[PDB]
Amino acid sequence: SQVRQNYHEDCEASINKQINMELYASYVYLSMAYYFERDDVCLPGFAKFFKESSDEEREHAQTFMKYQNCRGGRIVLQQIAAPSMREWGTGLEALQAALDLEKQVNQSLLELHSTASGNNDPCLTKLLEDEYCEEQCDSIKKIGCMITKLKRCGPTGLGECMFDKELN
Amino acid sequence: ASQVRQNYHEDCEASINKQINMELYASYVYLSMAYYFERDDVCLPGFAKFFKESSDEEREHAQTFMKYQNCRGGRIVLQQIAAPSMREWGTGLEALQAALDLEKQVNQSLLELHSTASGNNDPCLTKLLEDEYCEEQCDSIKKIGCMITKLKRCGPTGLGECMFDKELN
Amino acid sequence: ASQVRQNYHEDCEASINKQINMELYASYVYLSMAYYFERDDVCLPGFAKFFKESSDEEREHAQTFMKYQNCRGGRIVLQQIAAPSMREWGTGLEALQAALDLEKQVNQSLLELHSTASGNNDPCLTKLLEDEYCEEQCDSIKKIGCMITKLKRCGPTGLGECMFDKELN
Amino acid sequence: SQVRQNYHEDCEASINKQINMELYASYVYLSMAYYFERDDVCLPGFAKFFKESSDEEREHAQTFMKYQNCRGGRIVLQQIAAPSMREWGTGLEALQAALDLEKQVNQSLLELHSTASGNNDPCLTKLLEDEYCEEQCDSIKKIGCMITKLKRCGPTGLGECMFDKELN
Amino acid sequence: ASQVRQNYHEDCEASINKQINMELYASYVYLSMAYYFERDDVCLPGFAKFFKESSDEEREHAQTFMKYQNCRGGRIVLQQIAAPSMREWGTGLEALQAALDLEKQVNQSLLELHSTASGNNDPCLTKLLEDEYCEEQCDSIKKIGCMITKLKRCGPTGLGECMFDKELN
Ligand SMILES: [Fe+3]
Ligand SMILES: [Fe+3]
Ligand SMILES: [Fe+3]
Ligand SMILES: [Fe+3]
Ligand SMILES: [Fe+3]
Ligand SMILES: [Fe+3]
Ligand SMILES: [Fe+3]
Ligand SMILES: [Fe+3]
């Protein structure tokens, strides 16, 4: 490829798995979002929050797809796994699953940060610092704080309603 | 002496410096509380905002006594600012109680500053205390006392703590 | 530990807390310089404003590390803020060379933290550390260096100190 | 009380009597105001002036009530005496009674200023200087000047009419 | 007496009248300084404007005490305004040190009035006196002190006097 320069083969394949990981995480958040719009659940604040996180994750994937093209590597998209669950239980259990999801996505980010370093691609490591750090710490903290807040407000009943309203 | 020094006693100057350190101390305390309420296991952003503002407020009060020192020709002597002895503030209610006690300590020290300036017939010092550390310091004490009262009523824990923090924000 | 914690070494936590203390101390020193230049026998409002803004900036840097400590689910442990090395900062030039030293000292501590953060596989700490030490410390250490050169040229005392203080303001 | 600090018991009770004194003075001015709206009197300038002074005094009372609460003392409101008169006579006699009223309210203010001083409440004395002085001297002078002016303009007849119009 | 009079000692009345005279004299002196610096062999318009505004301010202070005298139903008794101590005020620095002296002198008389007002149980006189002596006399005596320090630093004559006069303007 005419633009390819100092782009290791294994950085190329790791970028493709991060793309799949973000598309998957976007799919989970989509599952959670419409689970909370069910008639027997009906937590619209939760639903909006997970709709947006699913748009966010789909945007992160496209960011890694654009970086792939811009390095002259070639995107390899695979199947996107079905979400592990269909019914996410309570609002609290959804958030705990989402925190796990976010940590799973960001562990995978670190694994790609070491592959970028152990191949001397200074500018893929530059980009990953602007994902895995730049805003990852703000996002992991945000779900952590939501969990702390929901456990305080009382994780069921009226405390779950009040938490929903201040999400929305 | 000084150019701009006119009816300014020595132990007024040393009490002013003691007051500067006290305000800087209280500012540090509030800074401790502000970022405690931003820990991921706490997450009381309304509490955090209130104490961050009280921290800035206390710092500006320290600077008011610093300008007045310079202005009567005294000399600012700045000392070490001790860290709060206890930085696990616990609940929102425990922090408000510690804060109320802090406010009264600062105001006790000011009140003793007011007697020393009385036994020196430095009416300017007594006036500075009156124009700056009384109209709103009786308000700062009352607003905390009133937050305590509200937090107690709403229930000091759980859902009522949440709704208190919301109405604070 | 804390549930948001992920890849955060214990020695990084302690070094962030040391850096919070350095920035607060930095801020205290600049507070001293600011009100010393507001003394009725000094009256350099340019220097005074400069150090008072540097003192605010330093306090802001300290909160940046406090926020970050909370990010990674570490524990802010605040320490006593030492009294500044002196009270009389001498000429405007002496105050500036002391400030340059103080800046290099704070930046030195960032470097030790930077190595510690690199030898612990913490990409995001070194990213944060790298920005503060490099991005704008080649702003602030350069600008104080130029002020020192400019004040030596304009003449470090007398009329030249006056004109420097005006062009600062 | 959790906020109470350096607030002597006798400053607390004196604040309550000043509250009653201001509510009383507000009641007198209300009497004077509607006396001057009587069909056989009909001095609308006088009436407006006394309506406003009755609002003013009711506001001063509330100021002392807020200060009581803010020091953590407790408000004790008593009966409010009927005004000493029903018919205030001429405009001039109303003003002379009002000057007496104002001096009676401000003497009571001084008595509370000495109690605040002889108990070392620097910040109750601070507040009373912002009532008994801040504007008391301006207000006592204003009624004094009105009396001087009405005696000049001729205190009865057309001079009373002219004075009314420049009040209004 | 007068029918608005209430709690107003006879010796307070006489001391207010003395203070009216001091402020008018103060104002006259500053009038001298202003037009001396407008002489064709002096031509310092900065100093000239400064003293001409101080002369207006002093005249305003005098009317403040006149108004107050009327408040308490005392009698304004005006006295002859003495000629200023000289006509040639010398250097800008000498004029400023004379102004500092003049300000301290007027402020001295306020203090004697303050004690007289306190030893006569006149809370409102000392309140008024306290404000003028303290509130802005730590404005005006400090600002002249800083001008004196600044003019000594910039060099009290020659080019430095020029630059000071420009930064005044
Ligand atoms: Fe993500
Ligand atoms: Fe304070
Ligand atoms: Fe306060
Ligand atoms: Fe810094
Ligand atoms: Fe800096
Ligand atoms: Fe009244
Ligand atoms: Fe004056
Ligand atoms: Fe003056």
Rounded Cα–Cα distance for residues D143 and E6 (Å):
14
What's the gap in Å between C81 CA and the centre of ligand 2?
Answer: 19
Is the CB of B145 less than 8 angstroms away from the CB of D72?
A: yes
What's the gap in Å between A145 CA and the centre of ligand 3?
Answer: 29
By what technique were these coordinates determined? X-ray
Cβ–Cβ < 8 Å for A44, A168: yes
Is the CB of D144 less than 8 angstroms away from the CB of E73?
A: yes
Q: Residues with Cβ < 8 Å from B91, sequence gap 6 or more?
A: B156, B157, B161
CA atoms within 13 A on the CB side of C110: 22
> Which of D95, D140, D149, D151 to probe the E interface (max E CBs under 10 A)?
D140
Q: How far off is chain D from B92, nearest CA to CA, in Å?
A: 17
Specify the resolution in Å.
Answer: 2.5
D5 → chain B, closest CA residue: B104
Of B111, B142, B149, the CB nearest to D6: B111
Question: Which of the ligands is closest to the CA of residue E142?
Answer: 8
Rounded Cα–Cα distance for residues B129 and B138 (Å):
12
Instruction: Find, among D122, D3, D133, D119, the residue nearest to D68 by Cα.
Output: D3
Cβ–Cβ < 8 Å for D116, D12: no
**Chain E residues in contact with chain C using a Cβ-Cβ cutoff of 8 Å:** 142, 145-146, 149-150, 153-155, 159-160, 163, 167
DSSP classification of residue A132: I
Is the CB of D2 less than 8 angstroms away from the CB of B126?
A: no
What's the gap in Å between D104 CA and the centre of ligand 1?
Answer: 75
Q: Residues with Cβ < 8 Å from C19, sequence gap 6 or more?
A: C65, C109, C110, C113
Is the CB of B111 less than 8 angstroms away from the CB of D70?
A: no
Do chains D and C have 3 or more beta-carbon pairs under 8 angstroms? no
Is the CB of B68 less than 8 angstroms away from the CB of E138?
A: yes
Buried-exposed string B128-164: b where 16+ CB fall within 10 A, e elsewhere: bbbeebbeebbebbbbbbebbebbeebebeebbbbbb
Rounded Cα–Cα distance for residues C140 and C130 (Å):
15
Q: How far off is chain C from E148, nearest CA to CA, in Å?
A: 9
What phi, psi does B81 have (nearest 5°)?
-110, 110
Rounded Cα–Cα distance for residues A25 and A52 (Å):
12
Tokens standing for B150? 């509200």
Q: How far off is chain C from E142, nearest CA to CA, in Å?
A: 7
Which chains have 3+ CB pairs within 8 A of A? B, C
Cβ–Cβ < 8 Å for A17, A104: no
Q: How far off is chain C from A126, nearest CA to CA, in Å?
A: 9
Q: How many CB atoms lie within 10 A of CB B111?
A: 19
